[PDB]
Design a protein around this ligand. Structure first.
Ligand code: NAG
Ligand code: NAG
Ligand code: CA
Ligand code: CA
Ligand code: FE
Lengths: 517, 638, 638
C-alpha cells in the first residue's frame, strides 16, 4: 500500500514528485508506493501525520522531541546512518564553524553574529545554545529573547519574527522553507561564506558539502570547547557534542513501522547512493538536504521497544527540557534528590509504600508491569533504582546503568565494608543518582536493616510478606562497592561472556534497543 | 508579545507611581470615619468603591445585596459586677462600650475562673474545674468563637475576654474592643444558603452559635476583677503580675448581656477584567470594607490595596498591553467583622457558578500590620507560587529578598476562622492565600476605636513602601495566575502534607493493630497519590505547551485537586467546612488523630465506632482523590 | 467519513446477523442454572463475560471486586402459622422457599390486616387501624421496600407479601418469590461509601433498613389465611374474590423470620472502547448478571443484550470504520437482586472519577418482558433523544414505528428504586434511561424459580426479533451519544418539568399568602431558567460546529445540568438520592408539595418550619441551576 510523505517548500515538492515517478518504474514489485503532501514547515508535517494526512517525514533528533509531545505522538521507526555502508554511525558531530583569524572563541561569542540551522535542531540550536543558557544574562526565559540579545545579528529558521525581531536580523521573516537562503546545514554555511554571520553552528560534514577544494577550506577554522581553534579536518579531536542521527517518524499506533522500512530499504538500493545515475535519495539538483540529509549513506531500522525518549537518551532529553525551561544545575548541594525506587508487583509497592513513610520521604515508589519496564523507567528519569539479578544487570548495563550496591548473604561483623563475589543481586541505578543511592540506602541500613524480630511492632526492610518483595529475604546487608564498578566490572569476566552468548538466541526487546546505537 | 519579565517590570513601574498612603488616608476621612456593617457610612464607601471601579473602566462592575442578621449593643448596655453569695453586693466593675456579637445576652452569675487564652489545651491543664462557673480569658490565642466554644464544652456559664498588658502594650487601659463568638462564617441565621430575599429567610439557626453570654472588658476592668480574685497565675503564660487564678469563696461575678439582633442591608461591590484565552476561569481578589471602629489596619489598608491593584491591572491591560489568559475579579466584602459574612454569602450563593471556574482566592485583609517579618498561610497548591514570589520581591525596609527561610514551607500555619480566605479554601475548595507583613506580636488596636490612620502611620513610618511591597506580592500572584497557559498551582505540594499525616498516624500503629485494623491501606492511599501527581507531571512534560486542547485537559485536572479533598460524606449545611485538610469537625484528617489520642490513655473518651468510620472515609477520601488524579476510570490499577 | 445514516444502516446490518435467542439460551444452561449473587455459578458467568469482552478485542477490560453483606435463608427456615389468643394453636400455613432479603427475622404475632398493595394512599383509606398488627399486601404496586417502609410508618408489626391471581395469572399456586426490603440501593452495611477491603468495613448501618420482619408467601398460603379472615375486599382493587379484609377476633397470625447475613465476593465486569476525539468522556451501559432464580427475563436477556451490543460496536469500530467521539463502557453488575448493589458500590466508589465525565447511563435490565407496548422512563435530558429514536426504530411485531403517542413525554413515569438506573440519575446526577418492550401487566415469573428460558420463549414466540429491536434502541442511543460533536442531551426539556412544578404549587397560592410568604420568587426562578437554556440554545446556533474549542465550552455546560439539580444542602451519606427532581426525601420538589397538602386540611401534620426551608432551598436550587447555566458569574442580571 502507498505511504504518504510530507514535503516542505516548492523545491522539496519537486524532489517528491521525482521520488514518485522514479519509484513506480520498478514499483510495485510487492506493494510499496509514495505520495506527496505540501506543507509550509516541519511543524506542519508532524501535525499532518497525526491527522492521518501524511505517514512519514524525516526529522532532526532535536525536532524528535517536538514530535512525540501531545498531541502529535510520533515514534522514530527508521534512522539514517552517517559515514559508510560498511561501518555505519548512528551519531554525528555538532560543530561550530568560523572564518580564519577572526579572534572570536567559544567563550567570547557575545556581540558576534550567528547563523543557525533551525530553531530546536541539534547541531544548530541545542548543542550551541545549550552551553550558553547558563552563561546568558537574565532573564533566561524566554530562551529566544536571550539569544536575540546575546548575539548582535542572527538567523534562526522557524522562529517567530513578530515576537523576536532580532532573531531574523539576517534572514527576514525567518523562513523554515527550503526556499529561504539560510536554512539547514548548508544554509547557515551560506550565511557565513557570504559574510552575514561570524559563526555558523552546523554538522562536521557541512564543510565538505559546500566546499570541495582543500585550499578554500583552509580559509575556515573550527572552534573547540577549551577555547581553542583547530583545523576543520580535525572534527573528532575538536567538536562541541555528539548527537543522535536524523530519523523518520511515524505514529506510535497506526503508523505502520514495517510498511515504511520496507519502502526505505528499497529506496536505498534502487535510487540511493552509488547505485543509480537517474535518481538519488541523498542528492538533488533542485536543493540540498531535501527529504533526507545528503551526508547520510543509507538507513537503519529502529527497534520496536525504543521510544523517542530512549532514542535520544537521558543525557540529551534532559538537556532539551532544561534548555526550554531555563533550569541550570548548581554545584552539587549533596542535599540528595528524593530516591525513586521501582516496584514490580502489587506486593512490592505495598512494602515499598510502607518503607516510603518510614524513611521520612527519602525513598518513593514508582510502579512498572515488567522487570524490563522498570529498567526503562530508570533510563528516562521516571525511576532511579531497583534490585536486579546477575542476568538483568548485564541487560541494564548495556543500556547505561551501573550498579552501586550488592546483596550479601553471609553474616559477618563488617558486612558493608567487605562485599562478596558470589554473582549476587545488584542494585543498579543511573549515572548521576549513583551518589545518593549510595548514601540514602546506607542510612536505612542503620534504621531498618539487621533488626531483632520486632517486625510486627516495627518495620523491617529485608523481611517480606511473601518472598523477596524488593530485596531478597535472606540478605543481611547491602554491600557498598568502593570500586567504580560497571556491568562488566561487577560480573567478573567468564559470566559476562556467558550471558552474552545466551542473549544471542534468547533476545528481548530491551536488549536490541540498548545495543542499537 | 509580552512575557513575565516584561510584566514584572511593567507592574513595578506602576507600583512606583502609585501612592498608597494618600489612599488609605482618604478612606479614613470623616465620612468613612464610622464604619459598622450596614451603616450609612458603610454604604457610603461602598458607592465610592463601586464608582471607582467604573472609573477605572473595567469590563464589568456589579453589586450583590444581602439582608443578613448581625447583633448590636442597644440602649440597654451590658454590665459586669461582683456580687455577694446571698445577693447583689459590693461594687460595679465596668460598662462595656465594646461587645461581642452573637452574644447570648442572658444574665448569669457565678465563680470566675481564669482559663487563660481559652485553648483546648488550656482547659485541660486547669486545676480548677470550670463545671458551672464563669471563665475569663485573654484574646488573641484562638478566635473569639473558639474561646467560647471551648468553654461551653466543659460546661461554662459565661465568658469574659480582656487584653492583658504583656500581649497588648496599650496605654489606655479603659479601651474596649469588638468581635464575634460565632463558630463559623457567614450569616448564622442562613447557614448553607445565601441571605437573598429569594429564600424568604426561613427559620434556620447555625450550630456555630453558643448559648453562653460573652462580653469584652478593658484591662482596667479585669485588673479590678483580679483584685477580688486570688491565686497567682503561672509563669508558664507570659502575662501581667496582676493576673489572678480564681475568685474568693465570699464574692463572685455577675455578667448581664442583652444584645439585640439587627437585620441590615449588606453590599458586596465587584469588578472584573475579562481574560482573553479562557474568560470563564477566574482568580478572585477580595478585601474587607466594614469595620467596627475606624479600621485603618483592619480594612483601611485592604480596601486601599484592592482599589489600587484594580487600578494597576486596569492600566496594564488598557495602556501597557497586558493580555491576561483568565479573568480577574476584585471584591469588596462587607460584614467581615461578623465572620467574613459578605464573602461567605457570596460563596453559598453562586457556588454552582464558580464550581470549577474559580481556581484561587487572594485575600488582602490585614496585609500590613508590622514590618519585622513576612507571614503567609495558604493552600499547599500555592506554596511554590509563593516561594518564587518571595525570592522575587524585596522587603520594604531591608534591601533583602523576602525568601530567607528555606524550610518556610514547614513553618506555615493553617488558615484560621476569622480570616476571609478560610471559607474559600475549606468550604468552597478554592485554593486561597493570605499574606501579611506581620509582626512578632499582633497589632494591638486591631479591633478597637484606636485603629486610626494616625495610629497606623505612627507605628509604621514607611507605610507607603510596605503597602507597595504588599501590593507587589499580590500583584505577582495574579500575573502568575492569569499570565500564561500553565496554571500556577502545584499539586505535588500535597505529597508532603499526606506524608505528614500518615507518619503521625503511623506513630499509633500499636493501637491500630490492637483493634481489628491494618494501616497498609493508608500507605497505598498516599503512595497512589504520589504516582498520580508524578504521572500528571510527566504528562505536562510530554505535551506541547502551545496546544490549547491538551493543556486544557491537564489544567482542568489540576484545578480539580482542591475540590477532591472536600469530603463528600458530610452535609454541606451542618458541617460547611468539608475540606479534609483545612476544614472543621470529625471527618478531617486532624480530627481522626485527635480522637485516637484518647485511645492511648485507655479512657472512655475515645469513640471506637467513630474512629473506624473516620478512618474508612478518610482512607478513601485520599484514595478517591488519587484515582481521580490519574489513570482515568479504567487505567487505574487498584 | 461515516455519518449517522451510514451508521444506522451499519448497525442494522450487524443486528440482522446477530442471534440473540441462542445467546440467552446459552446463559440459561446448567452451569449458570443457579445464579444467586456471590455464588460460584455467579462468578462462573462473570468469568465467561469477562473472557468474552476480551475476545471481542476491546480497548481495555477490567474488573472490580466488592465484599458486600446480603441476607440469606439458612437451615432455620421461616414459617407462618395462625395462633390462638392464649398461645400457639390451630394450624401451620406455609414454609416459604422464597424469603425477603434484609428481613428483621424477629418472631412476631398479631392481628393480620390487608393493606392491599402497601401504598401510602392504601393505608389512608383503610377503615381498620394498623397500629400494632401484622399487615398483608400484594406485590407489584410499589417496590417491596416501600411496602414495608409505608407499613412501618403507621406502626406495623410485620409484613406479608403474596401474588394474587388477578395481577399474576400463574398456574402453580405454591410458587414462592424473592426480593429485598431495603429502602435504597447498594450495600446497606456501607452506605455512602464503597465495599472495598480498603474501608476496613466499619460499623455503619443504612437508614433504609426496617426493623419489622418481612416474608413472601405463595397464593395458596394467602388463600389459606383468608379462610381465617373475614370482610370482603373492596371491588376498588382488581383482586381475587378470595381476598379477605381482616382476621377474626379469635385467631391471629404469627410470623417467625430468622434470616442470617452473609458476606460475599461480588464481581463487576467491565470493558471499554476508547473514543477518538474526547476519550475521557463516556457513556455507560450496564446490565444485571445475578438472579435469585434462573432469571432469564430478570437478567438473562439483559446480560445477553450487553454482550451482543459490546460485540456489535466492537465490530463496527474494528471492521466497519466507526469512529466514536467519546468512549463507551459496558458493565455487568452483580448483586442486582439486592438493590443494584454492584452498580451503586461502583458509583459510591469512583464518584470523583466520573464526576463530569459520565454523561449518560443506559440500562438493559428487563428490556424484554412483553410485546404489546414500548415503555421507557428516563431523565428529560434524554426525552428528545428517545423521541427521535422512537420514530426511527420499528416495532418487532407490527410493521409500525415505535413513535405513536405524540404526548408520550407526559405519560412517562419517574424511575423507581428497584431499577438499576435510579442510582445513576438520583445519586450521581448522570442522565439515565431504562427502556422496555413491556406488557400491560408485569411479567408474572419475574422473581420466581419459573423465570426459565423455556417460559420466556413460550410467552414471547418472537423473542429474537424483540431482542434485536431492543438492542437497536439502545444501539441508537450510543451512536447518537458518541457519534458527533453535539451531545444528545436536551436541557430545554426541563422547562416543562419546572413549569409543571410551579403550576402545581401555584394551586396552593392561598396557603402561601396566609403564611408570611410570596410565590413571586419561584416564578422568576423558572423564568430565569428558561432564559438560561434559550441563551444556551442561541449560543449553540451562533457557533461554528467544527471548532473544537467553542463546542467544548458549550457541551461542558450541557453536561453540568444533570449535576446542578442534585441538592447541595443534604448529606450524601444519609440522603444519597439528592436529585431534586428524581431523588428521595424532604428536599425534593415533590416532598415540598406533599408537605403542603397537609396544610390545606388545617391539621398538625404540616411542619411549617420545615416548609419554609423546603421552599427556600428548592427556590434557590432551581435558581442556582439557572444562574450557572447562563450569563456567567457576572453576566447574570438577578
Ligand atoms: C427584602 O426583605 C426586607 C425585609 O427583610 C425588606 O425590607 C426589603 O424591602 C425586601 N426587598 C426586596 C427586593 O424584596
Ligand atoms: C478482604 O476481607 C475479607 C473478609 O471480609 C477477606 O476474606 C479477604 O481475604 C480480604 N481480601 C483482601 C485483599 O484484603
Ligand atoms: Ca448563609
Ligand atoms: Ca456502599
Ligand atoms: Fe541534524
Amino acid at each position: 500500500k502507498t505511504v504518504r510523505w510530507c514535503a516542505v517548500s516548492e523545491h522539496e515538492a519537486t524532489k517528491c514528485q521525482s521520488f514518485r515517478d522514479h519509484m513506480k518504474s520498478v514499483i510495485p514489485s510487492d506493494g510499496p508506493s509514495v505520495a506527496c503532501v505540501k506543507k509550509a514547515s516541519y511543524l506542519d508535517c508532524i501535525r499532518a501525520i497525526a491527522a492521518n494526512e501524511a505517514d512519514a517525514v524525516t526529522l532532526d533528533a532535536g525536532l524528535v522531541y517536538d514530535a512525540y509531545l501531545a498531541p502529535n505522538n510520533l515514534k522514530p521507526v527508521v534512522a539514517e546512518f552517517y559515514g559508510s555502508k560498511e561501518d555505519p554511525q548512528t551519531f554525528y558531530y555538532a560543530v561550530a564553524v568560523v572564518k580564519k583569524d577572526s579572534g572570536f572563541q567559544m567563550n567570547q561569542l557575545r556581540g558576534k553574529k550567528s547563523c543557525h540551522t533551525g530553531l530546536g535542531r541539534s547541531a544548530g540550536w541545542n548543542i550551541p545554545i545549550g552551553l550558553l543558557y547558563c552563561d546568558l544574562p537574565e532573564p533566561r526565559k524566554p530562551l529566544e529573547k536571550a539569544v536575540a540579545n546575546f548575539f548582535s545579528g542572527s538567523c534562526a529558521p522557524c522562529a517567530d519574527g513578530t515576537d523576536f525581531p532580532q532573531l531574523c536580523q539576517l534572514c527576514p521573516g525567518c523562513g523554515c522553507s527550503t526556499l529561504n537562503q539560510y536554512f539547514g546545514y548548508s544554509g547557515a554555511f551560506k550565511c557565513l561564506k557570504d559574510g552575514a554571520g561570524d559563526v555558523a553552528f552546523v554538522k562536521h560534514s557541512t564543510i565538505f558539502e559546500n566546499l570541495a577544494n582543500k585550499a578554500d577550506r583552509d580559509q575556515y577554522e573550527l572552534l573547540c570547547l577549551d577555547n581553542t581553534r583547530k583545523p576543520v579536518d580535525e572534527y573528532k579531536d575538536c567538536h562541541l557534542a555528539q548527537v543522535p542521527s536524523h530519523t523518520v517518524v511515524a505514529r506510535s499506533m497506526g503508523g505502520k513501522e514495517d510498511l515504511i522500512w520496507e519502502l526505505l530499504n528499497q529506496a536505498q538500493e534502487h535510487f540511493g547512493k552509488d547505485k543509480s545515475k537517474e535518481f538519488q535519495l541523498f542528492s538533488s539538483p533542485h536543493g540540498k538536504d531535501l527529504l533526507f540529509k545528503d551526508s547520510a549513506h543509507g538507513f537503519l531500522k529502529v527497534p520496536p521497544r525504543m521510544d523517542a525518549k530512549m532514542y535520544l537518551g537521558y543525557e540529551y532529553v534532559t538537556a532539551i527540557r532544561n534548555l526550554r525551561e531555563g533550569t541550570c544545575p548548581e554545584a552539587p548541594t549533596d542535599e540528595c534528590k528524593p530516591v525513586k525506587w521501582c516496584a514490580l508487583s502489587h506486593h512490592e509497592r505495598l512494602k515499598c509504600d510502607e518503607w516510603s513513610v518510614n524513611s521520612v520521604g527519602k525513598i518513593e515508589c514508582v510502579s512498572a508491569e515488567t522487570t524490563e519496564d522498570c529498567i526503562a523507567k530508570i533510563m528516562n528519569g521516571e525511576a532511579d533504582a531497583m534490585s536486579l539479578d546477575g542476568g538483568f544487570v548485564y541487560i541494564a548495563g548495556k543500556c547505561g546503568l551501573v550498579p552501586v550496591l550488592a546483596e550479601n548473604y553471609d553474616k559477618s561483623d563488617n558486612c558493608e565494608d567487605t562485599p562478596e563475589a558470589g554473582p549476587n543481586h545488584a542494585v543498579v541505578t543511573r549515572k548521576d543518582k549513583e551518589a545518593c543511592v549510595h548514601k540514602i540506602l546506607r542510612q536505612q541500613q542503620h534504621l531498618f536493616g539487621s533488626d531483632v524480630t520486632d517486625c510486627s511492632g516495627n518495620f523491617c526492610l529485608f523481611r517480606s510478606e511473601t518472598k523477596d518483595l524488593l530485596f531478597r529475604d535472606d540478605t543481611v546487608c547491602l554491600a557498598k562497592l568502593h570500586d567504580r564498578n560497571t556491568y562488566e566490572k561487577y560480573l567478573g569476566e567468564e559470566y559476562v561472556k556467558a550471558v552474552g552468548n545466551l542473549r544471542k538466541c534468547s533476545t528481548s526487546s530491551l536488549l536490541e534497543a540498548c545495543t542499537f546505537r | 508579545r509580552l512575557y513575565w519579565d516584561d510584566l514584572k517590570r511593567k507592574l513595578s513601574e506602576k507600583l512606583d507611581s502609585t501612592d498608597f498612603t494618600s489612599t488609605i488616608k482618604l478612606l479614613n476621612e470623616n465620612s468613612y470615619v464610622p464604619r459598622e456593617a450596614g451603616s450609612q457610612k458603610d454604604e457610603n464607601l461602598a458607592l465610592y468603591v463601586e464608582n471607582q471601579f467604573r472609573e477605572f473602566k473595567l469590563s464589568k462592575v456589579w453589586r450583590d445585596q444581602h439582608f443578613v442578621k448581625i447583633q448590636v449593643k442597644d440602649s440597654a448596655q451590658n454590665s459586669v459586677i461582683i456580687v455577694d453569695k446571698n445577693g447583689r453586693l459590693v461594687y460595679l466593675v465596668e460598662n462595656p462600650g465594646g461587645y461581642v456579637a452573637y452574644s447570648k445576652a442572658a444574665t448569669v452569675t457565678g465563680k470566675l475562673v481564669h482559663a487563660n487564652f481559652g485553648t483546648k489545651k488550656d482547659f485541660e491543664d486547669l486545676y480548677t474545674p470550670v463545671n458551672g462557673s464563669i471563665v475569663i480569658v485573654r484574646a488573641g490565642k484562638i478566635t473569639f468563637a473558639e474561646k467560647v466554644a471551648n468553654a461551653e464544652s466543659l460546661n461554662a456559664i459565661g465568658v469574659l475576654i480582656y487584653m492583658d498588658q504583656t500581649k497588648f502594650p496599650i496605654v489606655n487601659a479603659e479601651l474596649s474592643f469588638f468581635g464575634h463568638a460565632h463558630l463559623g462564617t457567614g450569616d448564622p441565621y442562613t447557614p448553607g444558603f445565601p441571605s437573598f430575599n429569594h429564600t424568604q429567610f426561613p427559620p434556620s439557626r447555625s450550630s456555630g452559635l453558643p448559648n453562653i453570654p460573652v462580653q469584652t472588658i478593658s484591662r482596667a476592668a479585669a485588673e479590678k476583677l483580679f483584685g477580688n480574685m486570688e491565686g497567682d497565675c503561672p509563669s508558664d503564660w507570659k502575662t501581667d503580675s496582676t493576673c489572678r487564678m480564681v475568685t474568693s469563696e465570699s464574692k463572685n461575678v455577675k455578667l448581664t448581656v442583652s444584645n439585640v439582633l439587627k437585620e441590615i442591608k449588606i453590599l458586596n461591590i465587584f469588578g472584573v477584567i475579562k481574560g482573553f484565552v479562557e474568560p470563564d476561569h477566574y482568580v478572585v481578589v477580595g478585601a474587607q470594607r466594614d469595620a467596627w471602629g475606624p479600621g485603618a489596619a483592619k480594612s483601611g489598608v485592604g480596601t486601599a490595596l484592592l482599589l489600587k491593584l484594580a487600578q494597576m491591572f486596569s492600566d496594564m491591560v488598557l495602556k501597557d498591553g497586558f493580555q491576561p489568559s483568565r479573568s480577574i475579579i476584585f471584591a469588596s466584602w462587607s460584614a467581615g467583622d461578623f465572620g467574613s459574612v459578605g464573602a461567605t454569602e457570596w460563596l453559598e450563593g453562586y457556588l454552582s457558578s464558580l464550581h470549577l471556574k474559580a481556581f484561587t482566592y487572594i485575600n488582602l485583609d490585614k496585609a500590613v500590620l508590622g514590618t519585622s517579618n513576612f507571614k503567609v498561610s495558604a493552600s499547599p497548591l500555592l506554596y511554590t507560587l509563593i516561594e518564587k514570589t518571595m525570592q522575587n520581591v524585596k522587603h520594604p525596609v531591608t534591601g533583602q529578598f523576602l525568601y530567607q527561610d528555606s524550610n518556610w514551607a514547614s513553618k506555615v500555619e493553617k488558615l484560621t476562622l476569622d480570616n476571609a480566605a478560610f471559607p474559600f479554601l475549606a468550604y468552597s475548595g478554592i485554593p486561597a492565600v493570605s499574606f501579611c507583613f506581620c509582626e512578632d506580636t499582633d497589632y494591638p488596636y486591631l479591633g478597637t476605636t484606636m485603629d486610626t490612620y494616625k495610629e497606623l502611620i505612627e507605628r509604621i513610618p514607611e507605610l507607603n513602601k510596605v503597602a507597595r511591597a504588599a501590593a507587589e506580592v499580590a500583584g505577582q500572584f495574579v500575573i502568575k495566575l492569569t499570565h500564561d497557559v500553565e496554571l500556577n498551582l502545584d499539586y505535588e505540594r500535597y505529597n508532603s502534607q499526606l506524608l505528614s499525616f500518615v507518619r503521625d498516624l503511623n506513630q499509633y500503629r500499636a493501637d491500630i493493630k490492637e483493634m481489628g485494623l491494618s494501616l497498609q491501606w493508608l500507605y497505598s492511599a498516599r503512595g497512589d497519590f504520589f504516582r498520580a501527581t508524578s504521572r500528571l507531571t510527566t504528562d505536562f512534560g510530554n505535551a506541547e505547551k502551545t496546544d490549547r486542547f491538551v493543556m486544557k485537559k491537564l489544567n482542568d485536572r489540576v484545578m480539580r485537586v482542591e475540590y477532591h479533598f472536600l469530603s463528600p460524606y458530610v452535609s454541606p449545611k451542618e458541617s460547611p467546612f468539608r475540606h479534609v485538610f483545612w476544614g472543621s469537625g470529625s471527618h478531617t484528617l486532624p480530627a481522626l488523630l485527635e480522637n485516637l489520642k484518647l485511645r492511648k490513655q485507655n479512657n472512655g473518651a475515645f469513640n471506637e465506632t467513630l474512629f473506624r468510620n473516620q478512618l474508612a472515609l478518610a482512607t478513601w477520601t485520599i484514595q478517591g482523590a488519587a484515582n481521580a488524579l490519574s489513570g482515568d476510570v479504567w487505567d487505574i490499577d487498584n
